[PDB]
Write an enzyme that holds these catalytic residues in place. Structure first.
Site, PDB file in Angstrom:
ATOM      1  N   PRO A  71      41.139  48.041  48.979  1.00  0.00           N
ATOM      2  CG  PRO A  71      40.991  46.354  50.657  1.00  0.00           C
ATOM      3  CD  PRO A  71      40.399  47.246  49.420  1.00  0.00           C
ATOM      4  CG  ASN A  72      46.505  47.233  50.993  1.00  0.00           C
ATOM      5  OD1 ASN A  72      47.289  48.100  51.957  1.00  0.00           O
ATOM      6  ND2 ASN A  72      46.328  46.256  51.093  1.00  0.00           N
ATOM      7  NE  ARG A 114      56.531  51.433  49.710  1.00  0.00           N
ATOM      8  CZ  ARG A 114      57.628  50.476  49.933  1.00  0.00           C
ATOM      9  NH1 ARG A 114      57.874  49.475  49.730  1.00  0.00           N
ATOM     10  NH2 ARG A 114      58.359  51.563  50.856  1.00  0.00           N
ATOM     11  CE1 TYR A 155      49.366  43.459  43.173  1.00  0.00           C
ATOM     12  CE2 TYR A 155      51.411  42.781  44.463  1.00  0.00           C
ATOM     13  CZ  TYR A 155      49.875  42.748  43.913  1.00  0.00           C
ATOM     14  OH  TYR A 155      49.618  42.570  45.004  1.00  0.00           O
ATOM     15  CG  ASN A 172      41.292  45.305  42.340  1.00  0.00           C
ATOM     16  OD1 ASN A 172      41.140  43.960  43.198  1.00  0.00           O
ATOM     17  ND2 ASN A 172      42.818  45.106  41.565  1.00  0.00           N
ATOM     18  CB  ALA A 175      43.317  41.637  50.708  1.00  0.00           C
ATOM     19  CG  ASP A 219      25.416  38.972  51.683  1.00  0.00           C
ATOM     20  OD1 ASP A 219      25.490  38.464  50.168  1.00  0.00           O
ATOM     21  OD2 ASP A 219      25.294  38.504  52.082  1.00  0.00           O
ATOM     22  CD  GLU A 223      36.433  40.228  41.296  1.00  0.00           C
ATOM     23  OE1 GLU A 223      35.317  40.266  42.697  1.00  0.00           O
ATOM     24  OE2 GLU A 223      36.804  39.354  42.618  1.00  0.00           O
ATOM     25  CG  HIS A 245      41.363  40.510  40.597  1.00  0.00           C
ATOM     26  ND1 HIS A 245      41.351  40.817  41.705  1.00  0.00           N
ATOM     27  CD2 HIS A 245      39.799  39.591  40.639  1.00  0.00           C
ATOM     28  CE1 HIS A 245      39.835  40.249  42.956  1.00  0.00           C
ATOM     29  NE2 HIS A 245      39.225  39.487  41.991  1.00  0.00           N
ATOM     30  CG  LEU A 246      45.823  45.362  39.207  1.00  0.00           C
ATOM     31  CD1 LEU A 246      46.668  46.585  40.227  1.00  0.00           C
ATOM     32  CD2 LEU A 246      46.053  46.487  37.757  1.00  0.00           C
ATOM     33  NE  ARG A 274      49.700  36.862  44.439  1.00  0.00           N
ATOM     34  CZ  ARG A 274      49.103  38.697  45.024  1.00  0.00           C
ATOM     35  NH1 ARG A 274      48.285  39.340  43.892  1.00  0.00           N
ATOM     36  NH2 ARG A 274      49.757  38.807  46.308  1.00  0.00           N
TER      37      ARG A 274
END
Ligand SMILES: COc1ccc(C[C@H]2C(=O)[C@@H](O)[C@H](O)C[C@]2(O)C(=O)O)cc1
Ligand SMILES: COc1ccc(C[C@H]2C(=O)[C@@H](O)[C@H](O)C[C@]2(O)C(=O)O)cc1
Ligand SMILES: COc1ccc(C[C@H]2C(=O)[C@@H](O)[C@H](O)C[C@]2(O)C(=O)O)cc1
Ligand SMILES: COc1ccc(C[C@H]2C(=O)[C@@H](O)[C@H](O)C[C@]2(O)C(=O)O)cc1
Ligand SMILES: COc1ccc(C[C@H]2C(=O)[C@@H](O)[C@H](O)C[C@]2(O)C(=O)O)cc1
Ligand SMILES: COc1ccc(C[C@H]2C(=O)[C@@H](O)[C@H](O)C[C@]2(O)C(=O)O)cc1
Lengths: 158, 158, 158, 158, 158, 158, 158, 158, 158, 158, 158, 158
Positions: free
Chosen positions: J9-10, J17, J22, J76, J79, J89, J100, J102-103, J109
């Site tokens: 998501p996002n 943005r 980012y 990725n 959230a 699962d 996995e 992540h940027l 954080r």
């Protein structure tokens, strides 16, 4: 001036069930109280309403507002307020006022309802006034947009 | 119709210090915006204002409202929101609408500011709209008292 | 150069408390030790002393310091150091150096005495040195005003 | 009267760290400031300085102080203040005054920097005053040995 | 272009012990595969290797990086990742890209291993790929360093 | 049969300081009680003793035992018991009996002394018997090695 | 023999509000029942009553007890029981028997009400008996004071 | 010299079930190993054994030891170690050495098995050596009683 | 009018052990002072006493109270107060006034003793008055029972 | 050899943005750089991309991987990493290498972002390298898949 | 096929408890309902019932089941489900199916009723269905023995 | 009499999951077992099955049950049981019995699988019995509707 109103999970069953927290008013009834308010106050505001039980649809919908016919969002994310980092992230990239409304005072209910991820991302939070909270948000929104526009052109010129 | 407005600790230094959270508006400036609102909307409301840095004075003042010239309280208990079980107890025995207002969104600040004992005792909570939050509370209060009075006499008769 | 010394609750019963932690010195006696330290050091320094058991009076005082005859504050908030968010906010908006002093080593007592809200707001904290700690605070306060005052004249000339 | 100054890990990179918290001073420069303070004060005081990034070397040193040419210790254990039970035990068995100094206000940083094991063992703690804090420690150390030494001669004669 | 590879405690026992998590490869074999990668890819990169079981030694060697033959650091601080605020500070003051590598997925192990203080100080973290993770680090570091160089000449000549 | 005895930080100051937890016995005194025990019981055991204040030296020393002249370790990691994941990892790859001893009952002291990372990695833990605990460990070790050897050759043959 | 009865915040609203927990009796009626008890039992006891909603006032009045017309204190610090480290300190320095009374069983209420800082400072605590608890306190105080007196003359003439 | 041995819940099913933690030895088998040990070492010790699944019987039995034919207790309270404040209180009023034994290393099992209320009350704790732990306790006990008796008469005379 | 007095584990060892907290009085002496109180005050009250170290016995005896010669219970569940959900349930189902007594102030002891599950089930709790607390309970119980009786005949004949 | 790239998501709002965390690159640009990598390195790898803001869609697409044109997954989960036990699962039942990405460094954080449920289910985790992390994943996946193949034919023909 | 039904503390007062949660049924009545369910179903099933308020008796019984006339156990440990590690261990070493039953939904009550130690040991848990839950346990117990007994004959023939 | 069976995320991959916990049965196979149980029992019962990996679809379905052709719900929300406040609210406003089923014993798995929000809302919970658990849910659902329907006809006639 277009305002988006997003209603979260279970809010479509409102009015129909548990008069103790929520009373006897349907979701459609809340949406028409918001209409009267705008037409009565003679405000140049046009409301669009959206209700979903889906975390993803809420995020999709906030993302559409970026392509801006819309200038603000009034949102009650329902139980997703307490669990959704995603929706909070969506809100943080909207680039427009987002006000959170809850019918109930979430500071007075179960412990898992006290934190609002989403609320922390919104500029403001209104809770516990029932349907009324929604017009309070319209009032708030209208002042904020009015304020931003006054600032913008009056600061831009000089 | 008499409304009491109670302002908690440090709110008298408002406007004077830290434009980042609070902006450039004094406490006196907020109180006159609340006056305009009432006189403009032509409301039969008379405001009394009170500010103190003392937990006990707040409790004394809520206790006076019981001897009811007053019909409602709008309160920003300031930092006492997070620590005062006493003020929350005072509010719970007022026997009249109490609305809590915060200038800032306390869901977005330090961790020790997230819980409001007092907020849990109030019927409603408004946060993060700055001075505007106060007129939102007046609006809310007026509808609630108006609603209660309509219910009371119309239910009493039959 | 005027320096305010605020003393928190129960500090007036000093000289009558637990003789292990506090000894047998009086609050009056500490304030002499500070004068003597000013005299003997030729520090152009005018000290005012104020002790209260009321949270609100401390807030009042800190606030009156903003009508700035006073340039610094030396405070021992006492038990309120662990509970008062109000006093911590006041310190934050004093706009002048505030040094926190404790007689006892608060890292070495009960668990609830370890956090200092007030101390997180002050520029610096001194604990564990009994009465002597006040003279260390003076030493530093004098030294910080001297350094600030060389710095204010070093950037208005350029 | 010989006083040991131990400096913990990363203090040697001082003058090259985050310029906000620490400024642009060097560990060499702090040790001059302390000499200068001894000279200018006529304190019969011989200072030895020692800096290491090793927990064990600090323990070694504190232990060697027991072969007592040294009468007091001024220590800034650095990051080890929050993690080292070992150093805290060593302090506890030094049998002589130990004062802990921090440059920054550790009550005002991250959560894991708030507890000081080492500080609970010391007679006193000083934080927040940057370089100046070392001179405050000296001031107190001198004053505690003077008071101890008047007290050792006041009970061997009676 | 020198890259310093720091390996933490017990990594020298690698390959010889516990096949379930760690597999059949010695620390020296990992350092070969890294050299092979550089040699084959043809990169103008000189590796220097270092293993220690001493915290203060890791900090020492990071501190030596500042006097810069070294353009970057690849580190596996081992068990110290979870305990060493001090190493984390060293990394922060280094002012050079540091990548943290772990053979195993520390998210999938005991609870006390999930927290990396050192990781939070590094630019990036790689975990769970066995010896491969080490080459991934090299790739990334070479890419990070390439950008920096390009950026460095292009942002002065604008 | 070679047994290694590792003594952790501050255990060299034993006997010399705080008779309340520890009594009046030096570390050298404990080591000779362990000698008498072996020579008296006529055991074929040869003890090597090692004491350090350094987490890394302990890890180095456990790592040497792998190259096995040694058949077992008796260890009192001191304050490192509560903090060192590294030493616990070292112990887990020894591939030989490791018994942990504490002079004091760590279940009865401060809260931060209750967990032993290291103890969880050792086969067994002895606490609170003072110097005696050490001979209890020798007894234990001798039975365990005796047991392992009986099992090994008697199972190997058939 | 004077006994000071201190009543905390909101106890003046007693009797008038919330019948479920608190019942139908005013604070003045409680002070009558206490006088009646003393009068009927025929005890040489003079009661003095005091109610306040101010923390610093409670501390003040405890502090006044030390200059002693007063041989003891019965206190219901109200909501302050759970928050006031300062009142708890005052009680500790009083050096006289203090009993804490609560109308309700604070063990059976909200979680934030289970902790009494003040209670931990008092000799004894009575809770959950409504106004009766107040007389129970008197009984106990008269008995505690009787013992002390008997003990006082009998332990000097040995 | 009479030693009481108390075995807690489920320890009678030992040997019969789960060879992974416990192996193949019955409770009766442990008790006869303790006999051999005493008769072999030629010790003047007479053991009484008691096993129960009842928290109350354990407390009753510790209470009988006060009427002292018995001079010490060796106890494995089993799962009651982690839950029973009562048994810990019983132990604290025995007025005689109590040693706690566990077959398993409770620092390495589930989280709810890590704390021993009872262990904190005992002078010493032995864990993880299986049946052997019991003879280690006999050894310990015999030295302690021997030590106490040597001290007693040799200090009594002079 | 029978009042059942249940005493919990280790209270039979009372008087004989630990003078600091508990003093010089046996459980039988407490039961005398109670009878004396009833006899002197002239009250038509028959006491029955019961002590046990067994949880299930306490529950049994509460369960026997329901078949009612017994109009009430005074209980000191001892260490079980803090652990026994089961006794707490028994008290809730009893449907008769139960008062909980503790000799010591459980608010001022170890942390695991502050929680009373049983206390939260009782009407009222008395703590910290030594044996006196027991008579305070009697007073209260006689008063509680008097009210109930008066109330019982007066609320049927309306 | 198909590799499925799932983006959470996002991530579609990426590039457009918040430049601070980012940077300036769109999700489509990341998918280009990945194709470029495959094309240049000359690898027989077909990428398929997928982005969604719906949890159940991610699970659906993982579930589709089992019917296997797909030899692996790079994910990725955004959230959802921190909240979705369900996605975790799905990954576990996939029975294929999942990496996995992540940027950002989720260790550096907000606290609610440090926990990755999904990460704990994946073979490896890469974080904090911006878009680069995506290629690092490809490298690793190609290497992981190469090994598996080699291993697959070589372990059947023994 | 004999099945043991153990019932924990206070279950005997059933039919006299809080009428909301439990209704007005008796323990005798539940045991009839179970017989009736056996009769009417033609399940060759011999039921024995046992109720106690003693932890130890439950442990005794479970242990006697190992002298195995009984093949399964249906247990409602009551309040001990949340506190008894002892009973949980006994269940673990019964070597036969044990099903836990609760009348009330324990996920829906107080916080301390949520964990079931005993339930984590059982093969399965049933809560919330009042009396009916016992018949569900029977249904499952019969079905698990039938499946186990087809499985024991399916692997002794091959 | 129509009964809805909702199955949560990943339940469709059943028969392909971890073979220990789940076995080798399919979701299709469970739904047969339930039909067979209806057939063979002559329960006038029409079952509808629905499986989704989407939170929102579960909410949709539960909501559609309010257009009440369905009289009961049997739900296994899967991983959402531990995270979904939304589904728990929907259950709360269904106005008809909902039974939660789990295959595995969730009290016996990871820590985050222990709480069931959804389960606290349901009338009852069944866990640990694999496929058989669905037939137990049916048994109870039939029995609860029968009891409800005798109760609705027993209060409309009177
Ligand atoms: C009767 O069905 C309702 C479902 C949801 C709500 C809204 C509230 C809700 O969904 C909670 O989970 C949330 O924490 C607060 C809520 O969003 C509100 O009070 O507005 C109201 C009625
Ligand atoms: C600049 O001095 C100020 C002091 C207090 C406040 C009000 C806020 C405050 O006092 C916080 O401690 C509280 O948590 C929130 C607050 O009451 C608000 O945002 O209205 C604003 C400005
Ligand atoms: C078999 O000996 C080894 C010792 C340490 C390690 C490395 C890992 C380690 O030391 C842990 O304390 C740490 O949490 C993760 C580790 O650093 C890694 O996975 O790289 C690997 C093999
Ligand atoms: C007097 O100096 C001493 C320093 C350490 C010790 C050993 C104990 C210690 O170091 C604690 O930090 C540890 O938790 C327990 C200890 O290792 C022990 O009791 O053996 C004893 C005496
Ligand atoms: C196979 O049945 C047994 C039951 C209990 C025990 C003893 C252990 C026990 O009961 C645990 O609950 C306790 O935490 C540790 C224990 O007392 C021990 O390891 O001695 C051993 C075997
Ligand atoms: C000296 O033997 C005694 C044993 C127990 C007690 C009673 C106290 C007790 O058992 C604690 O576990 C409990 O927390 C408080 C106690 O019940 C009390 O103070 O009455 C007093 C003396």
């Amino acid at each position: 001036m277009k305002i988006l109103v997003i209603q979260g999970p279970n809010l479509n069953m409102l009015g129909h069930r548990d008069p103790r927290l929520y009373g006897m008013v349907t979701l459609d009834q809340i949406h028409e109280i918001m209409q009267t308010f705008v037409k009565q106050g003679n405000l140049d505001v046009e409301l669009e309403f959206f209700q979903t039980n889906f975390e993803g649809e809420i995020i999709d919908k906030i993302q559409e507002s970026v392509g801006s016919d819309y200038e603000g969002i009034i949102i009650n994310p329902g139980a997703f307020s307490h669990t959704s980092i995603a929706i909070a992230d969506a809100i943080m990239l909207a680039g427009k006022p987002v006000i959170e409304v809850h019918l109930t005072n979430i500071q007075a209910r179960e412990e898992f309802r006290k934190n609002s991820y989403t609320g922390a991302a919104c500029g403001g939070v209104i809770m516990g006034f029932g349907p009324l909270g929604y017009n309070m948000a319209l009032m708030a929104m209208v002042n904020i947009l009015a304020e931003m526009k006054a600032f913008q052109e009056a600061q831009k010129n000089n």
